[PDB]
Amino acid sequence: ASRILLNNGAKMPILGLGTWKSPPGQVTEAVKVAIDVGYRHIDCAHVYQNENEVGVAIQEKLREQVVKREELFIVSKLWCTYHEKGLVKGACQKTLSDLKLDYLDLYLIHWPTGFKPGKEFFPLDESGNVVPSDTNILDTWAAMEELVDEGLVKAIGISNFNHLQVEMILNKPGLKYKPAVNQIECHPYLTQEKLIQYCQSKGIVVTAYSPLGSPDRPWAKPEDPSLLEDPRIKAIAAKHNKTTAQVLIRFPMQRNLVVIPKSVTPERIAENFKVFDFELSSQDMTTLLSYNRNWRVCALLSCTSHKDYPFHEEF
Ligand SMILES: NC(=O)c1ccc[n+]([C@@H]2O[C@H](COP(=O)([O-])OP(=O)(O)OC[C@H]3O[C@@H](n4cnc5c(N)ncnc54)[C@H](OP(=O)(O)O)[C@@H]3O)[C@@H](O)[C@H]2O)c1
Numbered sequence: 001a002s003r004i005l006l007n008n009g010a011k012m013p014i015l016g017l018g019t020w021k022s023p024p025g026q027v028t029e030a031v032k033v034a035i036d037v038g039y040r041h042i043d044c045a046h047v048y049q050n051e052n053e054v055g056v057a058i059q060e061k062l063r064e065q066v067v068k069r070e071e072l073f074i075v076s077k078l079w080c081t082y083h084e085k086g087l088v089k090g091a092c093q094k095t096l097s098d099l100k101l102d103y104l105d106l107y108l109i110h111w112p113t114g115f116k117p118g119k120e121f122f123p124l125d126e127s128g129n130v131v132p133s134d135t136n137i138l139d140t141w142a143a144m145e146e147l148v149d150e151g152l153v154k155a156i157g158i159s160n161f162n163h164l165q166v167e168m169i170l171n172k173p174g175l176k177y178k179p180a181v182n183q184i185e186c187h188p189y190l191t192q193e194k195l196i197q198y199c200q201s202k203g204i205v206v207t208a209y210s211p212l213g214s215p216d217r218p219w220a221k222p223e224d225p226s227l228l229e230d231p232r233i234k235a236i237a238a239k240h241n242k243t244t245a246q247v248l249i250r251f252p253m254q255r256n257l258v259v260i261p262k263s264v265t266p267e268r269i270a271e272n273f274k275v276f277d278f279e280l281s282s283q284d285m286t287t288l289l290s291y292n293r294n295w296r297v298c299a300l301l302s303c304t305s306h307k308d309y310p311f312h313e314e315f
């Protein structure tokens, strides 16, 4: 069952390709291979610094008539330095330009935290803390809504929002378009039951990022755990004649989540897609859920004093 119906009426493929850390000289081939082997959803962001190269791939596959534009589901994200209402459209248009698209299927507020505008993605002061902007979630949301009305994006959503921040938007005076998606970190070590149930209860689809535990994240430490090497998960994969990665990808799918594993390795791109031919039992699902440790690999530790930092709240 390969697409989920969003609250904007569009169908989103439940498996997509992640692109954070995909080197610019490797990501065009990664996305080409992905489309060839059946991916129809690509997760992008301006801050990843590789959208031009992602776009080359998409355009070549459209030109080759491997796929039609309406069959693709392209996602990107508004970076923190563009939260001011007057900057949102230009940020979207830069992403559209780089991706070689005339619309996005989904555009997310990447984080609830606005930063001072400028050339620096992470403008810093002396204490190691980010320089905020005096922007707020609701005004940025209104600017996102304008993108729908101007035809630049088919759906808007959020990422890394806690349930109180989602509630803020849902309670917005004059709300025109509800968020379609909340994209959050989710894997067996950070199972997210409370936030997922909240979002799903509101008709908001959850996308699970870092489903393999982001082993390539640049701040990984040698003592940190590794989902791909967890012998309990290895054992579940063996029972099914699948890889650990395949179990880690199938897991969120069975929770009615979208999942976006990243790879630049052609064999793994193909492996990661081969997750529609097996099912985890309910007992296996509950067992995987039992591995939760509240272990977050993307904690945005330079922004813990920002007024809108999302991870002080329980969920
Ligand atoms: N919204 C947000 O704030 C946010 C935050 C984080 C991530 N995301 C999105 O979510 C995507 C996925 O998360 P992520 O990039 O953090 O990490 P991930 O998908 O959990 O893990 C990617 C790592 O796993 C490796 N890998 C992939 N498939 C494998 C397989 N079958 N066997 C063994 N190793 C495998 C990759 O290696 P190779 O590439 O070398 O094959 C890479 O090192 C991102 O790329 C981005 O699109 C969003």
Ligand SMILES: CC1=C(CC(=O)O)c2cc(F)ccc2/C1=C\c1ccc([S@@](C)=O)cc1
Pocket: 020, 045, 047, 048, 049, 122, 298, 299, 300, 301, 302
């Ligand atoms: C969590 C995270 C992500 C993941 C993502 O969105 O997919 C990311 C992606 C990028 F392209 C660049 C930075 C980040 C980041 C956190 C982070 C990194 C360095 C700093 S420096 C200011 O010390 C601060 C925060």
